[PDB]
Design a protein around this ligand. Structure first.
Ligand SMILES: Nc1ncnc2c1ncn2[C@@H]1O[C@H](COP(=O)(O)O)[C@@H](O)[C@H]1O
Length: 287
């Protein structure tokens, strides 16, 4: 039983009646060590332990508010606990739920485009103002080692040069999810599709979210065009250039996230190296 699992057991004890007990806390699948299934006498809970070393990256109070603010959209699953002290989310467990991946997401544009419209047109004022270039600096501060990626100064300066272009185009400010990996979509056995894991949610340009959806599921040009056709409306305008720019910023940011996570003891192999190289590729294609 890990330290993280012991802390989870303690936090869940507050959700139980005098009779009930925590039976087990086990690590769920996935890339990171954040996700756990907790079993109690009469209840199962999905747990995301996101707080470890992320105090300066994920503003826990911002995100606790964002949960209660976003609840009536009906997109996320039910929350039972959001622990500010350690950064731990305790949610409902949906039995026999299907987690989406790139292939399955591509069959469900009829559901997913309206979902993204719902969030981007919510008119909700989330706590948090996403600043991608400040985000880069946050990771740079937290990382102890000499940056392990090749040709970093030239790449960094090219990435930071995109700030001026974004200012010229004009950056929009809407409620965004910020982390549209396909595995953040889960389907109930009865058919309802959820969008989960809003830990990064913030006010941002909606083209960030589109870039993330497209990049994280490796959409083809045909899939991008088809999705944009579905998603585009007067209240959800589309900018292809912004999408291209945000893809580069995402690969940069998540490559730095990788270094920091590995410094804390995780092993993601060449995940970060490859994302960084894709930023390099994107910079060349953009220019
Ligand atoms: N309410 C739920 N019921 C069943 N599985 C879930 C639930 N919420 C999250 N999960 C799973 O846990 C993962 C959450 O972390 P992530 O892998 O980053 O999406 C999802 O991919 C789902 O597979």
């Amino acid at each position: 039983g890990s330290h993280m699992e012991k802390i989870i057991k303690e936090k869940i004890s507050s959700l139980l009646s005098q009779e009930e007990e925590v039976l087990s806390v086990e690590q769920l699948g996935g890339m990171t060590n954040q996700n756990y299934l907790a079993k109690t006498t009469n209840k199962q809970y999905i747990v995301k332990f996101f707080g470890k070393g992320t105090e300066k990256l994920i503003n826990r109070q911002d995100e606790k508010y964002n949960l209660e603010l976003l609840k009536d959209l009906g997109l996320d699953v039910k929350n039972y606990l959001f622990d500010i002290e350690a950064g731990i989310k305790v949610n409902e467990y949906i039995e026999s739920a299907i987690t989406l991946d790139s292939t399955s997401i591509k069959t469900k544009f009829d559901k997913i485009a309206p979902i993204l419209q719902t969030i981007h047109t919510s008119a909700k004022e989330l706590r948090g103002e996403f600043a991608p270039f400040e985000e880069i600096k946050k990771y740079e501060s937290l990382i102890e080692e000499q940056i392990p990626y090749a040709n970093y100064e030239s790449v960094r300066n090219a990435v930071f040069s995109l700030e001026k272009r974004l200012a010229d185009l004009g950056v929009d400010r809407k409620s965004c999810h910020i982390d549209l990996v396909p595995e953040n979509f889960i389907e109930s056995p009865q058919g309802r599709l959820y969008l989960i894991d809003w830990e990064y949610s913030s006010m941002n340009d909606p083209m960030w979210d589109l870039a993330a959806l497209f990049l994280e599921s490796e959409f083809t040009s045909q899939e991008e065009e088809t999705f944009l056709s579905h998603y585009e409306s007067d209240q959800t305008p589309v900018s292809h250039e912004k999408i291209a720019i945000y893809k580069i910023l995402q690969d940069t940011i998540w490559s730095l996230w990788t270094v920091y996570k590995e410094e804390q003891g995780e092993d993601f192999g060449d995940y970060g190296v490859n994302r960084y190289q894709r930023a390099v590729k994107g910079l060349a294609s953009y220019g």
